[PDB]
Amino acid sequence: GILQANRVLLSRLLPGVEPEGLTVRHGQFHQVVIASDRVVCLPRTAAAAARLPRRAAVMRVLAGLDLGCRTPRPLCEGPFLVLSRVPGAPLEADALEDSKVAEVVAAQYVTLLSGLASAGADEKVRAALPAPQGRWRQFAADVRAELFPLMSDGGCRQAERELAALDSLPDITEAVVHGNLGAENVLWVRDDGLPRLSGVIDWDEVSIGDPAEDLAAIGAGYGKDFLDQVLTLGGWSDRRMATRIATIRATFALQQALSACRDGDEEELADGLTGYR
């Protein structure tokens, strides 16, 4: 096992903590040992192990930004990286039925997103963070090579429309983009008056990019009414932005499928390809 195997390390990083009481989450690049107030990231390959010093720099940079909330702060690196655990829990889509909850939750997303946008200009950031060229064309090529063979003729025609539209996108690199800003990744303090944003986790996909990507993720998680509220509060409701959001949002099923295809995750692959086959 992973706990028994890394027990010497865990005894140094978590003195007196029984390793069999911990839990391990099985990432792509990393096993993540979860303690009460922190996690230990261990690379699953020599590729990940080589990348971990950069990941630690990235997390240190995010820890320095003004985002209106917490992020996993680097506590120790050695190969391993220890990050603080952000407290709180995801906010259930149903909570947004109360219009006063929706109002304060929308406002706090605007603060988060504004903070990420502003950070996009910073130097610490632009040089620590990934800024790939043509991520969406690379994606289009990956989909055609890897997913089209699994799709129906009608599926391939729908997908080829969605991919064609990715050419409409300007390769915009103005904001820090979380890249996977679903509901599960945004943590809240609940049951102490209206919900207050604790922080944001799962920064694995973080880059310099287009903030439409993060807005699309919010809409995917909470629906169009709520996204519309965020866009209006934040002054982001022009047509140019709406088009970028829709275009990117259209790729989310295919992103799920492409990941699931590479991961040998048959449940996610099936779910991802629903209506493409």
Binding site: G182, E213, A216, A217, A220, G221, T251, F252, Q256, E268
Partner: peptide, 6 residues
């Protein structure tokens, strides 16, 4: 995991 992107 997942529709948001994962």
């Amino acid at each position: 995991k997942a529709x948001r992107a994962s």
